[PDB]
């Protein structure tokens, strides 16, 4: 992982 | 967050009838075809992915 920037994907 | 991935960047945003954003994700480690458009609560752990974004919409590339 590069960074702590994450987000909820839709399936 | 068995769903939350890594952003690499958001690359495109567009707004629903309801005037709320959606945005165009490119997920760190996959391709372009596995981008998605994400409602905007799905970035609420994602502030420096949406800033970055309004950045980028100034400049040139």
Redesign the interface.
């Given at each position: 992982?590069?960074?702590k920037?994450?987000?909820?994907?839709?399936? | 967050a068995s769903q939350e991935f890594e952003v690499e960047a958001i690359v495109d945003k567009r707004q629903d009838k309801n005037g709320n954003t959606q945005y165009l994700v490119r997920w760190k480690g996959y391709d372009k075809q596995d981008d998605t458009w994400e409602p905007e609560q799905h970035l609420m752990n994602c502030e420096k992915c949406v800033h970055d974004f309004n950045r980028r919409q100034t400049e040139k590339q």
């Amino acid at each position: 992982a590069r960074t702590k920037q994450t987000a909820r994907k839709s399936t | 967050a068995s769903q939350e991935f890594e952003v690499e960047a958001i690359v495109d945003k567009r707004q629903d009838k309801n005037g709320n954003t959606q945005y165009l994700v490119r997920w760190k480690g996959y391709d372009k075809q596995d981008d998605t458009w994400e409602p905007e609560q799905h970035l609420m752990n994602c502030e420096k992915c949406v800033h970055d974004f309004n950045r980028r919409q100034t400049e040139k590339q």
